[PDB]
Design an enzyme around this catalytic site. Structure first.
Site, PDB file in Angstrom:
ATOM      1  CG  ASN A 190      -1.659  -1.541   1.131  1.00  0.00           C
ATOM      2  OD1 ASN A 190      -2.042  -1.794   2.068  1.00  0.00           O
ATOM      3  ND2 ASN A 190      -2.526  -1.502   0.393  1.00  0.00           N
ATOM      4  CG  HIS A 192       1.135   2.911   3.909  1.00  0.00           C
ATOM      5  ND1 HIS A 192       1.156   4.037   4.415  1.00  0.00           N
ATOM      6  CD2 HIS A 192       0.333   1.984   3.677  1.00  0.00           C
ATOM      7  CE1 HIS A 192      -0.144   4.154   4.555  1.00  0.00           C
ATOM      8  NE2 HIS A 192      -0.451   2.875   4.364  1.00  0.00           N
ATOM      9  CB  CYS A 227       9.625   7.886   7.311  1.00  0.00           C
ATOM     10  SG  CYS A 227      10.878   7.823   5.419  1.00  0.00           S
TER      11      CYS A 227
END
Ligand code: Q4L
Ligand code: Q4L
EC number: 3.1.2.14
Lengths: 269, 268
Positions: A190, A192, A227
């Site tokens: 996804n 991330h 992040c």
């Protein structure tokens, strides 16, 4: 892999790969961390939860709710060598208002000896606003039938290392690695940044002399903020201590916004 | 994994892991590349060669000689999905004075259909001086008993994509990603940057819009010079066209070339 006989835990075996080992020809701590997430994902798949890393139900997906890691704590006694078989057992438990926990035990398949253990704390959050929110009874009840009801802890000791508060490193740091940024391989399905990437970034600011003469025994990492794909990170470390201990801090390269803090404990080879 | 019945090739099955997949929920090309190196290493282990990535003999180790990749060429028709089983067969062959070759065939375990193929060219060099040097008859004879005698090619056709010459990208590049540097996870057991890291770096300068709307079908990468642990790299890409790109990896400072390559992408 498979659920155990009582259906309250999940076990899986892995053979250590050539590209998974470090300078000691044994699995790196990042390889171990990837394997922990992997067995966690297979446990979720085995009982019908999402396999995207958030281990959600249909009810939570309608509300845009997800489970996110707040802390990871890993203790390794023996890193498995290339070609060895490691067996990993994992289970979950609810910790009421504080959030939830996932624990792991790593064993050498040939001897049955415990070679490592890990624990992680999780909180529920809306994925869009990033606001924490307490689990409802209806959401919680769907998970409890997959968890042991009596406490089962990988770290049972009352004042154990896995629950210790971690302070914030003060400038100037003794060591630093600046300008770290994720590439596509650091992202999940996804987009991330994978939680294991932050482990690698914490360790980048450890001097190579320590890595060459010591082995990592314990790592505790708090996760404060993610992040993003286009962020740049600075990794800071200060020695706090035959054992070496360090205080760690990850922060955005520009404004210094904290994303992670942690501590490591190393033993001389 | 195991050597096949004739002992001239090696086969291994892998189940695709959750952290191994990209946004398409299928294995990334870097995961595939890691699996190719893995089955290569297990083939070397199975017949007594070194398992450090250089696949050497005792004679080569006394002379500080190693095998190093000069080119990797991979073609994927279908990326395996999370939880799927992929079977990979690999073999080697000597190409005389040009160097040696390792080939691979990837298959879907359930259907037996060929889902991808790869080839790689290798050269012998002294590990300390980095000078090329020809393989002696005594060294090469020890390897030939593990290779098919008749030509066996994953890409058999005369003058196919795997043998095409790659030009040098001229400035200005259409796209760039600068300041890339390896971390400890990018290094192998001997502290060298893993060959798969250079694949990831080439792909960093592909626009995200292309990655979102296309699938990588072919990648050819020439390896010219090693990026050391403390080096910093710039990744450059120019569209040459399906979408096709010319790629160049060079040191951030002086612009010394480390890799060049081409990619071919198919619209989803
Ligand atoms: C990948 O996610 C996890 O491993 N966890 C840890 C276990 N979780 C949980 C939720 C409710 C509950 F009652 C008991 C446990 C969900 C999040
Ligand atoms: C990891 O190294 C490899 O995969 N290699 C390099 C060595 N190879 C070889 C093949 C035939 C021969 F006669 C001499 C050497 C080719 C494959």
């Amino acid at each position: 892999g498979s659920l155990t006989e009582d259906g309250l835990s999940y076990k899986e075996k892995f053979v250590v790969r050539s590209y998974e080992v470090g300078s000691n020809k044994t699995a790196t701590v990042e390889t171990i961390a990837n394997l922990l997430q992997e067995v966690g994902c297979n446990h979720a798949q085995s009982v019908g939860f999402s396999t995207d890393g958030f281990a959600t139900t249909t009810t939570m997906r309608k509300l845009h709710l997800i489970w996110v890691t707040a802390r990871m704590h890993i203790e390794i006694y023996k890193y498995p060598a290339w070609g060895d078989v490691v067996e990993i057992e994992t289970w979950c438990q609810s910790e009421g208002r504080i959030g939830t926990r996932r624990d792991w035990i790593l064993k050498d398949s040939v001897t049955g000896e415990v070679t490592g253990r890990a624990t992680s704390k999780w909180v529920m959050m809306n994925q869009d606003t990033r606001r924490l929110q307490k689990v409802s009874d209806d959401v919680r009840d769907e998970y409890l039938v997959f968890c042991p009801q009596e406490p089962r802890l990988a770290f049972p000791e009352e004042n154990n290392r896995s629950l210790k508060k971690i302070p914030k490193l003060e400038d100037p740091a003794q060591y630093s690695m600046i300008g770290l940024k994720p590439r596509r391989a650091d992202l999940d399905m996804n987009q991330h940044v994978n939680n294991v990437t932050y482990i690698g970034w914490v360790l980048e600011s450890i001097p190579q002399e320590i890595v060459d003469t010591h082995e990592l025994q314990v790592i505790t990492l708090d996760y404060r903020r993610e992040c993003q794909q286009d962020d740049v990170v600075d990794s800071l470390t200060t020695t706090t201590s035959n054992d070496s201990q360090f205080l760690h801090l990850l922060r955005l390269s520009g404004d210094g916004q904290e994303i992670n803090r942690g501590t490591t404990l190393w033993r001389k080879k």
